[PDB]
């Protein structure tokens, strides 16, 4: 559910 770092 967490945001990935681009």
């Amino acid at each position, epitope marked *: *559910q*967490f945001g990935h*770092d681009s």
Partner: antibody, heavy 122, light 113 residues
Framework: EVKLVESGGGLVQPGGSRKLSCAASGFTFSDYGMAWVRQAPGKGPEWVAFISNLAYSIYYADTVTGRFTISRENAKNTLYLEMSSLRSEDTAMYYC???????????????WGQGTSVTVSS | DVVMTQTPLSLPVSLGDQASISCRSSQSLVHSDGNTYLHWYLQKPGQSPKLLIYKVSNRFSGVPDRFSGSGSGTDFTLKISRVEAEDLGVYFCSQSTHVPPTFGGGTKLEIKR
């Protein structure tokens, strides 16, 4: 293959501290969010902590917030869990797990280590 | 948190038979991105959970054809077409649509006698 190996468990006094580590291999560590998940005997897994691949985002389960700290060092392929103010109910097997992603969301814990065991007892 | 409820707690089977296990979420698992982040794990004694199925119906690398998953919204099912001895263990469903990710209590696949 993807491999995760946890270390740092052991027997700790209530109110004590412990720092777990997780050594990652077989993938590009800096590309993946990582998590800690714990399991008490007879019980299901319980997610503990999450850290994103560049550590922009950190999340904790309500049961450990204010006592546990997750960190990572991408250059050393290592994930950490700093545990403080330990309590009897923190006794568990602690697993390191990788989060997979396809676009902008870490959405499944796909590979888990074999675990490091933490016992909190006086 | 999202509550994951598995039934039955224990499922007895004979080798070679079919098995189905159920998982119900207290809240819809359809994400805003349109995916349904519902997964299934198998855990054998002394080992960590291994991923079997992710996003309702996708088999993880190396998982045999006899495993399949289905469902929608809040009701999901894991099906084993013909149970092998290596399939015995505790099955967990899990959701990652909402923070925090949560796990069901487990369904133990045991032997009938």
């Amino acid at each position: 293959e993807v491999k995760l190996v946890e270390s740092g468990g052991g027997l700790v006094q209530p109110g004590g501290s412990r720092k777990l580590s997780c050594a990652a291999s077989g993938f590009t560590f800096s590309d993946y969010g990582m998590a800690w998940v714990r399991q008490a005997p007879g019980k299901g897994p319980e997610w503990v902590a999450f850290i994103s691949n560049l550590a922009y985002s950190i999340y904790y389960a309500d049961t450990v917030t204010g006592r546990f700290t997750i960190s990572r060092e991408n250059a050393k392929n290592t994930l950490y869990l700093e545990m403080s103010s330990l309590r009897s109910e923190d006794t568990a097997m602690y697993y390191c797990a990788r989060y997979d992603y396809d676009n902008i969301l870490d959405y499944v814990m796909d590979y888990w280590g074999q675990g490091t065991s933490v016992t909190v007892s006086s | 948190d999202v509550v994951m409820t598995q039934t039955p707690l224990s499922l007895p089977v004979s080798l070679g038979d079919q098995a189905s296990i159920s998982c119900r979420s207290s809240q819809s698992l359809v994400h805003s991105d349109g995916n349904t982040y519902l997964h299934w794990y198998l855990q054998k004694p002394g080992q960590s959970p291994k991923l079997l199925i992710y996003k309702v119906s996708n088999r993880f690398s190396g998982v045999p054809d006899r495993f399949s998953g289905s469902g929608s919204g809040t009701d999901f099912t894991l099906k084993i077409s013909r149970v092998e001895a290596e399939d015995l263990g505790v099955y967990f469903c899990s959701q990652s649509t909402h923070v925090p990710p949560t796990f069901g209590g487990g369904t133990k696949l045991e032997i009938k006698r």
